[PDB]
Amino acid sequence: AQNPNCNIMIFHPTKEEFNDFDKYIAYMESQGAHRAGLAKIIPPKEWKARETYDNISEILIATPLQQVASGRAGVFTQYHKKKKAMTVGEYRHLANSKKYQTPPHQNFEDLERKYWKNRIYNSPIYGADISGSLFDENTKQWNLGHLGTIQDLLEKECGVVIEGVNTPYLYFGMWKTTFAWHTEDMDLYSINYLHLGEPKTWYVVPPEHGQRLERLARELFPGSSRGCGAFLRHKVALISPTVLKENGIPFNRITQEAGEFMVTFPYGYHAGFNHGFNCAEAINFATPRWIDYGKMASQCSCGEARVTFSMDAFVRILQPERYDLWKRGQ
Ligand SMILES: O=C(CCCc1ccccc1)Nc1cnccc1C(=O)O
Numbered sequence: 001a002q003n004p005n006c007n008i009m010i011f012h013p014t015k016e017e018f019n020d021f022d023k024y025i026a027y028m029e030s031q032g033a034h035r036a037g038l039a040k041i042i043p044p045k046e047w048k049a050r051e052t053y054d055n056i057s058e059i060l061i062a063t064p065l066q067q068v069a070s071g072r073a074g075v076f077t078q079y080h081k082k083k084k085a086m087t088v089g090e091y092r093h094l095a096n097s098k099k100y101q102t103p104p105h106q107n108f109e110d111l112e113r114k115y116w117k118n119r120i121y122n123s124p125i126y127g128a129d130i131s132g133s134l135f136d137e138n139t140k141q142w143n144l145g146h147l148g149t150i151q152d153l154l155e156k157e158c159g160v161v162i163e164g165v166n167t168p169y170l171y172f173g174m175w176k177t178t179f180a181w182h183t184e185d186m187d188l189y190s191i192n193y194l195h196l197g198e199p200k201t202w203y204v205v206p207p208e209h210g211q212r213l214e215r216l217a218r219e220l221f222p223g224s225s226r227g228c229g230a231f232l233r234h235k236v237a238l239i240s241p242t243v244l245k246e247n248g249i250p251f252n253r254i255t256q257e258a259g260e261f262m263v264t265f266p267y268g269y270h271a272g273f274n275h276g277f278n279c280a281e282a283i284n285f286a287t288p289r290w291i292d293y294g295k296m297a298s299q300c301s302c303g304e305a306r307v308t309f310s311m312d313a314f315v316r317i318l319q320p321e322r323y324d325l326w327k328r329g330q
């Protein structure tokens with residue numbers, strides 16, 4: 001068994017190795033990368049996502065989300081309050097303002113301490129889930145807008161043609177903007193490229209221990225748990241590394257910097273925060289190894305969790321028994 005401690009692995013593909021996405025994901029897994037639930041990939045020195053980021057101020061964030069916290073410092077829920085549209089130029093200026101800017105800090109460790117101590121007392125604004133891409137059309141390797149689709153993977157493995165098209169999303173962040181504990185829709189993989197700006201810190205639980213996190217979550221958020229058997233799908237629940245330690249939940253942490261890829265693996269619970277103004281791009285993907293996770297994925301049928309048009313087909317084909325109840329749920 002490779003990577004039995006489930007450590008987060010960091011990869012440095014050569015230009016040649018960076019030419020076949022599926023092959024390299026399979027290679028990473030042959031080294032046990034998936035057992036951590038998250039891997040970092042540093043692209044070849046000669047590679048670039050696009051020429052410059054000089055002309056991105058005019059992107060619209062149609063619905064910025066103010067992330068409002070309830071609970072205690074290390075155990076809280078966050079709800080998203082919709083705000084008026086703003087351009088990325090306006091957003092960046094807001095992120096850099098005295099009210100929202102990254103505070104003085106010694107290092108990543110000091111900033112993490114400040115995040116968990118102080119996060120709940122501020123309400124940062126997140127420009128999340130914006131359909132689009134910042135990869136140059138001519139970028140041929142690891143272009144998140146040119147990956148093979150989940151629908152084609154499911155067709156290749158199961159011999160069934162289905163509707164749907166999955167495309168990338170942009171995320172414009174500032175200090176304290178947060179992603180709550182979750183696995184991907186249908187326990188898919190995700191790939192995240194940090195285009196520019198300040199770092200993003202990640203926490204992850206190994207897939208083999210995901211049910212331990214779920215059990216702790218039910219204990220820590222009893223109301224939410226009664227409401228929905230898969231409430232973590234709502235992406236509202238935060239639990240600090242201190243609280244995870246106290247409860248013996250195995251986990252790992254790593255900081256992603258601009259120019260680096262992170263891949264999350266099937267059923268790898270993850271959460272994190274942004275250090276300051278930044279922009280990331282992400283998309284879900286699948287491999288043959290995902291199919292069995294897709295079949296076993298928990299579903300929110302309470303109506304809260306956002307269902308994409310594409311997920312109908314995944315549930316319909318992989319989870320026919322669950323399909324009706326899930327459908328009437330939302
Ligand atoms: O889920 C999110 C953003 C929150 C989406 C959301 C949740 C609830 C309500 C509105 C939007 N973001 C990520 C997820 N998984 C890995 C990384 C991120 C990220 O923010 O870079």
Ligand SMILES: [Fe+2]
Nearest residue numbers: 183184190264
């Ligand atoms: Fe995610």
Ligand SMILES: [Zn+2]
Nearest residue numbers: 228300302304
């Ligand atoms: Zn639910």
